[PDB]
Amino acid sequence: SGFRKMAFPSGKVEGCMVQVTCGTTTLNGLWLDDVVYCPRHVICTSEDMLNPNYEDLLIRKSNHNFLVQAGNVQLRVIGHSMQNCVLKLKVDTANPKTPKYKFVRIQPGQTFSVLACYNGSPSGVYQCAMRPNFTIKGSFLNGSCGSVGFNIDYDCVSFCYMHHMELPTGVHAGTDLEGNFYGPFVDRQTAQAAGTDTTITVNVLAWLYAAVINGDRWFLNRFTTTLNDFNLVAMKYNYEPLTQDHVDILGPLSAQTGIAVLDMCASLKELLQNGMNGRTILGSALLEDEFTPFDVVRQCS
Amino acid sequence: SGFRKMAFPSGKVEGCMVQVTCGTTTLNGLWLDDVVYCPRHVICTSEDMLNPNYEDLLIRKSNHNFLVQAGNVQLRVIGHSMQNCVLKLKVDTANPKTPKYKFVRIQPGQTFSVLACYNGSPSGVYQCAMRPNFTIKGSFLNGSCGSVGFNIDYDCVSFCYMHHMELPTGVHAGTDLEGNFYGPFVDRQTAQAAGTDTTITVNVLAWLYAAVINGDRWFLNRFTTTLNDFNLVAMKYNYEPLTQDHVDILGPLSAQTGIAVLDMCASLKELLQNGMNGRTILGSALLEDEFTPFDVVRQCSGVTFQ
Ligand SMILES: O=C1CCc2ccccc2N1
Ligand SMILES: [Cl-]
Known part of the structure; x- marks a missing residue:
């Protein structure tokens, strides 16, 4: 007996976390098959984030602009594309640690495990709920962007969350792995508030x-x-x-x-x-x- | 910002968890190099539970009485010995997923991650503290014995707890990875009760x-x-x-x-x-x-x- 806030075991996900650098910005990527997933906002200077034109900022970039690192090993980026607010970096190498996975969008009130990562390095795992206001009460510092949320169903990892931003109340907002935000939020430095929960x-x-x-x-x-x-x-x-x-x-x-x-x-x-x-x-x-x-x-x- | 009960990434420990079966008793063991560590009470039967003579019950065991299972691979036990309240099965394979590890005994107030495991399969991870009364407020059902507590400060897995038993007040008692209990507890089902916490x-x-x-x-x-x-x-x-x-x-x-x-x-x-x-x-x-x-x-x- 006993009852504790319990995350899923994170090893299937630990095996998928890489580091992604575009200019000065480093943050975290998800390496599944031969694609690396991260927030599109990686490509943005500070001035950029004020009012970003991602279409335009992205065509301006090339594959060698993206430094993807799995431990000590450079992956070669051989292609880049945007899906909603998520950047997809095609790499030369499929992840030999890729688990059985799907992309799932969760409903408010449903829970998931967050693997907080920094510089592509897994740091911590905690259970979170998708709040009715589409925030999560996370624990996130600078570098946490691209940390993922997931469930495990038998042996299949269901990826539901990618971390994008902190709101001024100390709560967190991000997307599903198809780059669609949870809640009425945008990836732009601007006035955004947590709806009343x-x-x-x-x-x-x-x-x-x-x-x-x-x-x-x-x-x-x-x-x-x-x-x-x-x-x-x-x-x-x-x-x-x-x-x-x-x-x-x-x-x-x-x-x-x-x-x-x-x-x-x-x-x-x-x-x-x-x-x-x-x-x-x-x-x-x-x-x-x-x-x-x-x-x-x-x-x- | 934000602040959360935050456990360590459990993957380095997941890769070490096995099923140990002795008689009709299944629990979890910790597979590091060529050794599987599990609670010695795995070798007890119904009567044995009150006044087990562990040295007597163990000397009567062959290697092939211990059925070890890493997912589907059956590890072959080539040796056994006891250290305090921990059983050490030698096996014919060093776990290829053995991480950098070490064994540390912690003090009351210290925290660690628990990888709750059933039948050698991890079920979840959470944070606990060693209570001043030397128990932990865990989430442990039957079959959870052999689940371990750990820290991972800087890519090295410090193992500090192995789960042995639930006390009557619903709190949990265990050993370090050298088989010494935290607190005045013993691996016997004689009446024992945690001190006031x-x-x-x-x-x-x-x-x-x-x-x-x-x-x-x-x-x-x-x-x-x-x-x-x-x-x-x-x-x-x-x-x-x-x-x-x-x-x-x-x-x-x-x-x-x-x-x-x-x-x-x-x-x-x-x-x-x-x-x-x-x-x-x-x-x-x-x-x-x-x-x-x-x-x-x-x-x-x-x-x-x-
Ligand atoms: O942690 C434990 C040890 C074994 C057990 C048996 C029956 C009910 C609960 C438990 N929990
Ligand atoms: Cl300590």
Whole structure:
């Protein structure tokens, strides 16, 4: 027993991280088959980033403008292209460490592991949720750009995130591996803010199930509720509405514990109104919303 | 910026994880060079669990009683010996993925990454601290025994923990990679219970220094404290005593923020007296004790957000 924020094992991804230099900018690349993926903004001076014309800045570049380094080994760049906000550097050499992989775009409320990297060197791994406002609460310093987010499904790595920028609130924004941003953000030094965030209701409920499974049960109560009744409480507390879809996904945990979701919603309803009455739940003073039902099921069974 | 419970990249350890089977018992082992390390309790049966005589149960074992499996490759065991509470199986192949490694025994307050493993397959990685009571607050189901804790400071894998058992209060107990338990625990299912746990004070201060580096200032105060007065207050909240050593170790974070250790101690005394009054620090509504001064410097910039 016990419950911890748990990343996927990162070795399949560690094997794919390279260093990418274009002028003065160094940051991180993802080396899969014979292509290296990184943020298109690598090609930008400071003056460039104020109002970049990537079409124009890119044609101006050539293959030898891109210094791709896998450890001590220069890869030869033999082609460059842009897909949305992601640069694709064709290389002479396929990655002999390429895993079974796909590119996936995740939904807000879904979690993934971030492998923070610096100068192409894996540094750290932590679990993150794609916030309802399409930010992630990351831990990123200069050089972190091109660090990737992923899930592992059996042996297949699902790449969902590439790190692009920090916002002025200290939260992080990036793209899927097809270069489409998560959230209403652009790769340009300009005025950009994190939309007001909301709490991921289905995840909070998954985490209360995990707490119950680990013998933390004080917050439980005889009551139940209805979607409508709860969702008006949720709405007030800046909580995502709970759909009939979320209640079904919780069915396993509702089964294993003998609390029905609307029974647990009753517990959560009271915690929002009345607080935690000084206690903690799985060593947290907060209602933790970055564990999915699947994260709780995967970890606890 | 940002601040996260951050584990080390687990790939160097993934490449060393194997399945060890003895009798009806399967757990994980650590395959380094020609040796697989696993908890010696793998060789116990039902009765053996209370008063195992490990030297007696081991002398009765042949190499071919130990079934080792690296993915699909069956490693052939060519030798066995015991060191304290760790079993060492010699095998006919040195693990080709053996990294630069070393074995270190850690002190309470130290942090490491745990690569949770079932049937020799890694399932996840997370950060833990050695609690002052010599347990760790892990996430370990049945079959997790032989999972290891590690640091990877500068391309060398320091192995510091191997998981042996869950105590009745849901906390976890294990050995160094030389098979010596952390704490007064033994690999017998006789009644044992962790000592009352305390908050890792030096770690809480390092985390407050992290909050200030990340731009949070609301909890500072115009006050200071003597080291002695801080200890007499902190210990009434079940906090570890802060030593001069702990004071010295915080000097660098003190220097980077320009807040004296004992000023930051006054802030902690007040946080302990007031709680958070609806606020949060680096995303937590409690005082966090599982980041070391070293962890704070590693994760944080060299520039403060003043
Ligand atoms: O860590 C552990 C060791 C073995 C075990 C057995 C039964 C329930 C939980 C556990 N957890
Ligand atoms: Cl130590």
